[PDB]
Design an enzyme around this catalytic site. Structure first.
Site, PDB file in Angstrom:
ATOM      1  N   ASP A 181       0.862  -1.217   0.000  1.00  0.00           N
ATOM      2  CA  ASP A 181       0.000   0.000   0.000  1.00  0.00           C
ATOM      3  C   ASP A 181       0.891   1.258   0.000  1.00  0.00           C
ATOM      4  OD1 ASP A 181      -2.474  -1.388   0.001  1.00  0.00           O
ATOM      5  OD2 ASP A 181      -3.168  -0.510   1.913  1.00  0.00           O
ATOM      6  N   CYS A 215      -2.325   0.184 -13.507  1.00  0.00           N
ATOM      7  CA  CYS A 215      -2.362   0.267 -12.028  1.00  0.00           C
ATOM      8  C   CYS A 215      -3.547   1.165 -11.672  1.00  0.00           C
ATOM      9  CB  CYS A 215      -0.991   0.704 -11.515  1.00  0.00           C
ATOM     10  SG  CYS A 215      -0.275   2.138 -12.377  1.00  0.00           S
ATOM     11  N   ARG A 221       3.533   2.195 -11.068  1.00  0.00           N
ATOM     12  CA  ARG A 221       3.822   0.725 -11.193  1.00  0.00           C
ATOM     13  C   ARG A 221       3.839   0.299 -12.678  1.00  0.00           C
ATOM     14  NH1 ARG A 221      -0.453  -1.165  -6.413  1.00  0.00           N
ATOM     15  NH2 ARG A 221       0.167   0.479  -4.915  1.00  0.00           N
ATOM     16  N   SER A 222       2.907   0.792 -13.481  1.00  0.00           N
ATOM     17  CA  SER A 222       2.783   0.492 -14.929  1.00  0.00           C
ATOM     18  C   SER A 222       4.086   0.904 -15.642  1.00  0.00           C
ATOM     19  CB  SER A 222       1.582   1.217 -15.500  1.00  0.00           C
ATOM     20  OG  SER A 222       0.342   0.642 -15.077  1.00  0.00           O
ATOM     21  N   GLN A 262       6.579   7.579 -10.715  1.00  0.00           N
ATOM     22  CA  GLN A 262       5.874   8.686  -9.972  1.00  0.00           C
ATOM     23  C   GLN A 262       6.715   9.231  -8.795  1.00  0.00           C
ATOM     24  OE1 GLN A 262       2.003   6.486  -9.296  1.00  0.00           O
ATOM     25  NE2 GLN A 262       1.140   8.505  -9.695  1.00  0.00           N
TER      26      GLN A 262
END
Ligand SMILES: NNC(=S)NCCc1ccc(Cl)cc1
Length: 284
Positions: A181, A215, A221-222, A262
């Site tokens: 998370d 994601c 994450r992508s 990110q």
């Protein structure tokens, strides 16, 4: 500069934030006018994450052709990826229309439906064989055929049927279920195992349309998934694998979709995964 050495030099100097900000400063800026039209507000999960007009995927219909999805085309690596947001309640039908129209074999999912107590994407696939989903807006049917649950990922076999022509295709759903998370994984071992299972499937190969990767926003994450794949493929193809510059590959990919990777922690994790994955790629 051998990236493992560049790695220890950024770690010892603690300059991950400074490297990451230089990337953000040099990144491409292109228009996203279709994404910002008022008729498309409910087709966007986040106001600050839009596809560029030049690289956006178009839906094959005269009404509204818009989806929050980009074609990332890597010329030297000979790989293509579609990167998209997690589908919304009113875009689940558009999502499966795009899978159909682009002839994709695989969908890669890097998030859980709920994280941090909030919904990150719609429940867009069926959970029981006997309870199929129908998307009436795009005239598609989706059935769960099989499911294989492992400790770090789940693979599902789905049947997508174009109700207009009665054609069917098999779609593989690769679901990475253990990204934390907060932050990034401590070891890239289970992420690299997952990437090699997607490759083995044929989903990333030129005989199919591009893989669909998501994601929540389709950039973080992508971004990590496609950057790692492309960097390891270039290390296999070139005479000098140490020539592969991960910052330059990331800026090339950012010509096609904004914001890929990110945080400074996601940048560090991307280096870790390529460095560790190369100790298979180089002969082990
Ligand atoms: N092991 N035997 C199998 S898988 N029989 C066929 C069932 C099936 C497979 C794939 C799709 Cl897309 C739809 C239906």
């Amino acid at each position: 500069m051998e990236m493992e050495k560049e790695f220890e030099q950024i770690d010892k100097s603690g300059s991950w934030a400074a490297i990451y900000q230089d990337i953000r400063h040099e990144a491409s800026d292109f228009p996203s006018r279709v994404a910002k039209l008022p008729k498309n507000k409910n087709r966007n999960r986040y106001r600050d994450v839009s596809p560029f007009d030049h690289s956006r995927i178009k839906l094959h219909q005269e009404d509204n052709d818009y989806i929050n999805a980009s074609l990332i085309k890597m010329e030297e690596a000979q790989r293509s990826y579609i990167l998209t947001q997690g589908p919304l309640p009113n875009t689940v039908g558009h999502f499966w229309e795009m899978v159909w129209e682009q002839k994709s074999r695989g969908v890669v999912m890097l998030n859980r439906v709920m994280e941090k107590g909030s919904l990150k994407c719609a429940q867009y696939w069926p959970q029981k064989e006997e309870k199929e989903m129908i998307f009436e807006d795009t005239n598609l049917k989706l059935t769960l055929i099989s499911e294989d649950i492992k400790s770090y990922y789940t693979v599902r076999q789905l049947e997508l049927e174009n109700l207009t022509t009665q054609e069917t295709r098999e779609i593989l759903h690769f679901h990475y279920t253990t990204w934390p998370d907060f932050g990034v994984p401590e070891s890239p071992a289970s992420f690299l195992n997952f990437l090699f299972k997607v490759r083995e499937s044929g989903s990333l190969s030129p005989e199919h349309g591009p893989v669909v990767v998501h994601c929540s926003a389709g950039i973080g994450r992508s971004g990590t998934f496609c950057l790692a794949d492309t960097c390891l493929l270039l290390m296999d193809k070139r005479k000098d694998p140490s020539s592969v510059d991960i910052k330059k590959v990331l800026l090339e990919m950012r010509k096609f979709r904004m914001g890929l990777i990110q945080t400074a922690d996601q940048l560090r994790f991307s280096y870790l995964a390529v460095i560790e994955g190369a100790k298979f790629i180089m002969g082990d």
